[model samples]
Target: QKLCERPSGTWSGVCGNNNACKNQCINLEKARHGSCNYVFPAHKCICYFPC
Candidate 1:
């Protein structure tokens, strides 16, 4: 598994919803799954896949 920040930067309410943040990572990197997280000032996207 690997962790990467959201491509669009910080996580907003809208970005956090609709799997936008998660999908971004999945679509971009073709990862298995993605998730959002809180990291101080900005939110982060955690990409999970076989590595």
Candidate 2:
């Protein structure tokens, strides 16, 4: 998917400016998990949960 904008802060370098995904979030577990079958948007590399 086309990123609305680049991931803010430090991730901007690693993921690029709205080009790639970023590894943000200090707590990975708090990020939520997928159903282990379907790739839920909430569990994606980028955080779109509660959207």
Candidate 3:
């Protein structure tokens, strides 16, 4: 998913591997913990911290 779609929260500023696709950090805050999906109209990564 695009970076902007990611929720607002603490994120690690680092990139691994040649392609800037692996391990794209995201806000793991309670309200943001899930995988990205296109089921909804908008395209964003739904995330939430583990229980």
Candidate 4:
């Protein structure tokens, strides 16, 4: 499996909760699964799927 991380949003802005971020990745990238990770100053979206 491969994982990818990126800021979660339709554009540049503060990210929402886990569900929102996950849905963002799923809807946008068609990822198999998605989650939110708490980073230094903010949260980001991480997506995982088969490579």
Indicate which candidate wins on lDDT.
4
lDDT of each: 0.55, 0.29, 0.33, 0.61
TM per model? 0.50, 0.18, 0.27, 0.56
State the lDDT of candidate 2 residue by residue for 1-51, as single tens digits: 332322233332232222233234323322222121113333223333321
Q: Model 3, stretches more than 4 Å misplaced? A: 1-22, 26-34
Q: Cα lDDT of model 4 overall?
A: 0.61
What order do candidates take by lDDT, descending?
A: 4, 1, 3, 2
Name the lDDT of candidate 3.
Answer: 0.33
Order candidates by TM-score, high to low.
4, 1, 3, 2
**Can you write out model 4's per-residue Cα lDDT over 1-51, one digit (the tens) per residue?**
565454533523455567877787778866667677676777656555445
- Higher-TM-score candidate among 3 and 4? 4
Best by TM-score: 4
Which has the higher TM-score value, candidate number 1 or candidate number 4?
4
What is the alpha-carbon lDDT for the whole of candidate 2? Answer: 0.29
Better of 1 and 2 by lDDT: 1
Q: In candidate 4, which residue pairs clash?
A: none
Q: Of models 1 and 3, which has the larger TM-score? A: 1
TM-score of model 3 relative to the true fold? 0.27
Which residue pairs in candidate 1 have backbone atoms (N, alpha carbon, C) closer than 3 angstroms, thus clashing?
A: none
Q: Give per-residue lDDT, candidate 1, residue 35.
A: 69
Model 1 scores worst on lDDT over the 10 consecutive residues at: 5-14
